């Protein structure tokens, strides 16, 4: 089997991407944030505290003839950005782009943090990291991909995120028309539950490539590119007037600037992030100070190849017995 679904930016900045997902019988379609940095499929629901729902579409398990309470199971998750959610668990039929999993754990939110409430466009998350990170207790549950894998034509999914445009998540096949050149594959460590890999270095603009190992995670659920402070300083030094602002929470730059590109290495291959992908717009409405899309990972404890990086590539998440990651230009 295979599946293919379009993923759409939630706003003009590409702050996140939403993908429609069919849950239950008859189908209830929710727009979920596919997140290769976590491993829970959770949704706003009829059980979510009413004051914490503001415009989201909810899953109502009582209206699904295939929903079953997973007795005694609860979940609770906290994300790197400080947001969180928790609740109980149903199993139900879940389909993405024509690919169907029966008996998928659907984690129903009883509580969500303010950041989730305040974002009316995201109805929940669909985790695509390794199932070892799943938070369901006392019986850990499998991700949608893990459940689908054996049935897929090939045990892979691909992320093809757009810049200020829709893109595609495919399951079970590699669309050879969706990228240019070849796909370069690179080793993955699953030790921390992430799609963790080592970039071979970077360049800023038309500058020389610096060969240096940068361990980090491929994370579709993180907006920005978080890299070591040395790398980030080298980038922003090429933008007149750019500075790190403790009050804003990262590097800012004059909105009048033209940003240089940023290149990262994948083995001997190179992925070029155009400068415009690094512009996250005014820090507040009407400001001439703009927020940067490359930020320091210092104090995160891990480097994160988030959407800024991934949307410059066609990315293969290869879930073979020994997982790997592939990157192609596009």
Curated annotation (Swiss-Prot):
The source's domain of life comes to Eukaryota
What keywords are annotated for this sequence in UniProt?
Answer: Aspartyl protease, Disulfide bond, Hydrolase, Protease, Signal, Zymogen
S-S bridge residues: 255-290
| Gene Ontology molecular-function annotations | aspartic-type endopeptidase activity
**Residue positions of the active site:** 35, 199
Return the EC number. 3.4.23.22
What residues does the Peptidase A1 domain cover? Answer: 17-328
Broad enzyme group: hydrolase
The keyword Disulfide bond is assigned to this record: yes
One GO term under biological process is: proteolysis
> Catalysed reaction per UniProt?
Hydrolysis of proteins with specificity similar to that of pepsin A, prefers hydrophobic residues at P1 and P1', but does not cleave 14-Ala-|-Leu-15 in the B chain of insulin or Z-Glu-Tyr. Clots milk
Family of this protein: Belongs to the peptidase A1 family.
What protein name does the entry list? Endothiapepsin
Q: What is the lineage of its organism?
A: Eukaryota, Fungi, Dikarya, Ascomycota, Pezizomycotina
């Amino acid at each position: 089997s295979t599946g293919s679904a379009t993923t759409t930016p939630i706003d003009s900045l590409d702050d996140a991407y939403i993908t429609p997902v069919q849950i239950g019988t008859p189908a209830q379609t929710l727009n979920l944030d596919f997140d290769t940095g976590s491993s829970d499929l959770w949704v706003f629901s009829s059980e979510t505290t009413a004051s914490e729902v503001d415009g989201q579409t909810i899953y109502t398990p009582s209206k699904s003839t295939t929903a079953k309470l997973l007795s005694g199971a609860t979940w609770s998750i906290s994300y790197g950005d400080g947001s969180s959610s928790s609740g109980d668990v149903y199993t139900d039929t879940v389909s993405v782009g024509g690919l169907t999993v029966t008996g998928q754990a659907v984690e129903s939110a009883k509580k969500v943090s303010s950041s989730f409430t305040e974002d009316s466009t995201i109805d929940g998350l669909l985790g695509l990291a390794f199932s070892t990170l799943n938070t369901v207790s006392p019986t850990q549950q499998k991700t949608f991909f893990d459940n689908a894998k054996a049935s897929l034509d090939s045990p892979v999914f691909t992320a093809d995120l757009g810049y200020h445009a829709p893109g595609t998540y495919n399951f079970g096949f590699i669309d050879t028309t969706a990228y240019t050149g070849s796909i370069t594959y690179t080793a993955v460590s699953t030790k921390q539950g992430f799609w963790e890999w080592t970039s071979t270095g970077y360049a800023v603009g038309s500058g020389t490539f610096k060969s240096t190992s940068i361990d980090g995670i491929a994370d579709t659920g993180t907006t920005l590119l978080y890299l070591p402070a040395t790398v980030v300083s080298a980038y922003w030094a090429q933008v007149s007037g750019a500075k790190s602002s403790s009050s804003v929470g990262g590097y800012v730059f004059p909105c009048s600037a033209t940003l240089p590109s940023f290149t990262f290495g994948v083995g001997s291959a190179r992925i070029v992030i155009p400068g415009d992908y690094i512009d996250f717009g005014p820090i507040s409405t009407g400001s001439s100070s703009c927020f940067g899309g490359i930020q320091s990972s210092a104090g995160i404890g891990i480097n994160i190849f988030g959407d800024v990086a991934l949307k410059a590539a066609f990315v293969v998440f290869n879930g073979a017995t020994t997982p790997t990651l592939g990157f192609a230009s596009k």
